[PDB]
Amino acid sequence: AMDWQKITEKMCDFIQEKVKNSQSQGVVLGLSGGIDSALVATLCKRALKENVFALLMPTQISNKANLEDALRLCADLNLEYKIIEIQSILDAFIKQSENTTLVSLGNFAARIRMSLLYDYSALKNSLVIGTSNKSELLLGYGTIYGDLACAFNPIGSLYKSEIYALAKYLNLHENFIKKFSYTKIDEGLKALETNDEKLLRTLDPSLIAMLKNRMQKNAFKGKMPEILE
Amino acid sequence: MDWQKITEKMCDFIQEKVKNSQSQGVVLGLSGGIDSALVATLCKRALKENVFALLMPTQISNKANLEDALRLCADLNLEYKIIEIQSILDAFIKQSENTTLVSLGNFAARIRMSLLYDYSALKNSLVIGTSNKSELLLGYGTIYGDLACAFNPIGSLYKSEIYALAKYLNLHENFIKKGFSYTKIDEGLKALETNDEKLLRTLDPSLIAMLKNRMQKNAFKGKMPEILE
Fold first, then answer.
1. Domain A1-229 fold
2. Does B122 sit within 8 Å of A98, measured CB to CB?
3. Pathway it belongs to (chain A)?
């Protein structure tokens, strides 16, 4: 357990600092209906008031709780937004692809969202604020140039488990929390990162072997392209 | 300067990235420009059969760029695919609220990077970049567009050096047409980078003011997103 009031203020400062030190007037984020997203949208409204904009980009719109939740948020925060259903763009890429896996579909969709976010950011003279947490950053869940693309990110050093607790501190709607203590994954991640050789022996070796396996093979995502000299 | 040695250094580099990777080879975008063609030439020398190119013009009618790119592929025995992207592009534009030559170009660049990344998964390969140092310093490229790649062998060579190296490697003349010399821009860029206060007083101040103005406002393209701590 830690100091959320102080953490929150630190984050708002940081957000304000990026916008003041920039030629931009505000930020835009993608808002999917997940806890990270909603957290970042909350902080942004606290920090920037009217200068916030969200794109909601599901691939299909029918009856997904995610959209319900996303929209209930936008209305609640008085956040300006636009729903853009991306199946069409996605179909057009798929027709040019020679591979038809789901993984391939997810990667496209992630980069379609980044392209739209960036297009709107030029429109609105704004920065793109990232929403990846430290767990997903260490494990390389994201797509490079996908949801990993942004100008900055206030929550990139908080583990998933910390996100939950922070969200609870800020009274985010319960649907975010539904769908403090660290999970086993987060604790192993944290132990490895802080070389807590002490907790490490406590933990399950098979788990650690996989946590190590992931971060190793996906480290290139946190790095710039290597230019030869 | 010593092209034979530079060539061999680059081939080593390219081989070193593929060996040290889970990947079997590389894939690049091939537009018909000198950088591209140069990189494709190096790749075939370095990796033989393990190279693949995507040619993604926005429209296909009778552009010399396509002729030149295809002439290259056949001549190098490079495996490739032509993907005309105007459909994907129409699909984005339809969701955009800001029509602008700049807006289009950016979508186009990010479409190409998405297809490159998709084919790279398909072929279990890395995406090799093709930006030269001049374009890197001046911030011509699109972030997460043509700036997105795993690595880049030519990112430290100025445009003027590209031309000379190309001439050394006997690239088809159409690339060169459209004892070497640096352009004014490149020499100013080089002078600034290497703090040659000596050549600097030689040069035109208006030029330098602009070179400085560019690199300053586009330095964020060479940097990762800033995460708050």
1. Rossmann fold (3.40.50)
2. yes
3. Cofactor biosynthesis; NAD(+) biosynthesis; NAD(+) from deamido-NAD(+) (ammonia route): step 1/1
